[PDB]
Design a protein around this ligand. Sequence first.
Ligand code: NA
Ligand code: NA
Ligand code: NA
Ligand code: NA
Lengths: 286, 286
Amino acid sequence: VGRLIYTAGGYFRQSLSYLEAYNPSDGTWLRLADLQVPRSGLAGCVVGGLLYAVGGRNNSPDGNTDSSALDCYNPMTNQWSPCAPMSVPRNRIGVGVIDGHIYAVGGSHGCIHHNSVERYEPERDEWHLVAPMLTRRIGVGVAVLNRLLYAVGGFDGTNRLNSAECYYPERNEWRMITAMNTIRSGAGVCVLHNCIYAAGGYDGQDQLNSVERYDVETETWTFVAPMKHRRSALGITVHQGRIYVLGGYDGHTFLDSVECYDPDTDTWSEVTRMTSGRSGVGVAVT
Amino acid sequence: VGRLIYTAGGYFRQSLSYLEAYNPSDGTWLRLADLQVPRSGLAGCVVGGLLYAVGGRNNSPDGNTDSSALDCYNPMTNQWSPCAPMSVPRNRIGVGVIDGHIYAVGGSHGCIHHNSVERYEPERDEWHLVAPMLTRRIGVGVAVLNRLLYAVGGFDGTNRLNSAECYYPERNEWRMITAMNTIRSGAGVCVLHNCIYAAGGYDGQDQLNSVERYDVETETWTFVAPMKHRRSALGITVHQGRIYVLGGYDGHTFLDSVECYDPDTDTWSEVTRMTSGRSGVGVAVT
Ligand code: NA
Ligand code: NA
Ligand code: NA
Ligand code: NA
């Protein structure tokens, strides 16, 4: 099939411009075209074979600037192009795709913590607001399952969250679901074999190595095997029925480690290293 | 004989836990007990031979937590002990001492820019609200002169300030005084030979190297010699009739520079370097 894991931006001493692609078949890395503006705390997603980099910020020694930007990478041309910006900047954003539309969830603009949600239509190059979440969430994770969107954990401006809620696109409304076992902001959230996984993050004291998964029909969260390395602000994605987690912060180091979860054996292994340690990347597969 | 300049906390990529002491006699630095929790934008002060660290925040890769904390350092035991916390968190706070009581002035909690002021009594370990300032002020400097407390400059949420106001403890009220020549948030404010000095800061465009002083009887601000290096969020104190400024930010670099003002000759000289560059430290002498 020949699909790659793309990692965009990140943070080490400042926000970064890197776009690199890992091939899990032959263990190779490509160095592709730099972002036009450095970005960390962003999200990656794919629609119709194009890579999108959504929100984040530029934390340099010269200043802090939260991003409302949407930028589109075409793997055929190795070129980044600007798209219409979001209504508001969103640092530590969550994103999901339903039916070829991009949903931008939560995030921060300076001291402001958003509950607002907006939807991008690629064919019209336009954003529109939809119903807001029940809870303000920054450092939030997002998963799409059965044409519904789930927002998991984060920070509401006062409290770090174990809570999660579910968006119904046809009805345009949110409902709270069963809360996680562990409080998590800056966790990796994805979907594997009809379950929502939450890996790592920060519980208010420590960076986590624990991993839990939500079965939509049993309505219960269950612990699986933990990761080797504790990490917050990790990238996460799924390639060929396996979870890959990229980089993050362990409370001392910005990690170059990539771990892989095999659901059949319930084991994690270290598969490769990024070319340099970083946190707050956006990641997607195409 | 044998008073040291203590520097506590600060920021370089993340909030710091350092306590270090400079001896201007022999040019030595001591490395003392780390703060229990990292802090930047705090203020330092001394009562009865004890050093106090008041307010600030912990800007780490996992979050931004404004601090209401008051912590006491005993140089005889090299130990930090927790004291009663303030009514509210105060980042980029101002602090002054009158009659063995600590005054906490202004600062921020998230989006909120405080005009409130509270007073700590060490003999009872309690805080109480006193009259609020006429102006909301974060990045404010404080000076005590003739048993009155002066609040100088800062940022009110919208505008940076050249305004200054005077607190009367017996009457429990504030009055505006003559405004500075220059707009300054994050200046160093101290008292030397019966005048209030404001050194450096930020005017909304540039970090400043200018220095002006207020004479309470002429009701006039006058420029003196400028520092060698422009800086905001600097530490400031007085030792043996001279002003010491420690570190800060120049719009690109976090400074390790310590400069010294001789008022007899109206000249600044570089006397030493901190072990590492940092801004937003708390400083006091004992
Ligand atoms: Na920055
Ligand atoms: Na996800
Ligand atoms: Na932070
Ligand atoms: Na002062």
